[PDB]
A = this chain, B = another copy of it.
Amino acid sequence: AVLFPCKYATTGCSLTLHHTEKPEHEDICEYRPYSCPCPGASCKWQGSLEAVMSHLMHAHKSITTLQGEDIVFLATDINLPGAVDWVMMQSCFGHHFMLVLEKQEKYEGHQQFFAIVLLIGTRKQAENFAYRLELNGNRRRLTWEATPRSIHDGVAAAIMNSDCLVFDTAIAHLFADNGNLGINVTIST
């Protein structure tokens, strides 16, 4: 049998791994760094999973942080042009969740909104949770319920595979007030 160095050999992992062992090990490797998970930012930070939240609080002060299982994510200025990201952190149940709203032309010439929640944590940890995103309006409601994505998999892929709440600009306007959009986010465990 042939063995390959771990993905994280450069950051200190000395294990040599067989093809039957390699991906499971790399999910849990103690020498695994995570990139800064904030979308739309040019940040080169690399650190262990339990340092991510501290980094977001110190270096990304535009990201608002709210406490509790049931919050309002107020995305201001939804009529801004081009690709825009709104990011907020929600802290509940001893964990931290990143709430993302992104406006972009995923399909050419069609600006849409994408909303998703990601756990600062592993896939396995994320399976213990579910979340609900709710746009509430004048006799209308639009809801997405799912399992939060892990930082392992990231924001961008979810958006690309429409595995998130997707809505037209017109829909955002049905729910908006004062040029802002309030999104109710509930985390369940």
Contacts and interface: CB of A to CB of B under 8 A. Distances in A.
A142 B143 contact: yes
Interface stretch (A19-27, A33-41, A78-86, A165-173): A165-173
A109 interface: yes
A167 to B, nearest CB: 7
Interface residues of A, number: 24
Given A142-B143, A162-B167, 5 more contacts: A107-B107, A107-B110, A143-B144, A162-B174, A166-B168
B161 A170 contact: yes
Nearest to A147: B139
Interface of A: 107-110, 130, 139-147, 161-163, 165-168, 170-171, 174
Instruction: State the number of copies, please.
Output: 2
B144 A141 contact: yes
Contact of A139 (B139, B146, B170): B146
B167 A171 contact: no
A122 to B, nearest CB: 17
Contacts of A110: 107-108, 110
B171 A162 contact: yes
Contacts of A163: 140, 170, 174
B167 A166 contact: yes
12 contacts: A108-B109, A108-B110, A140-B146, A140-B163, A141-B143, A141-B144, A141-B145, A142-B144, A142-B165, A143-B145, A162-B167, A163-B174
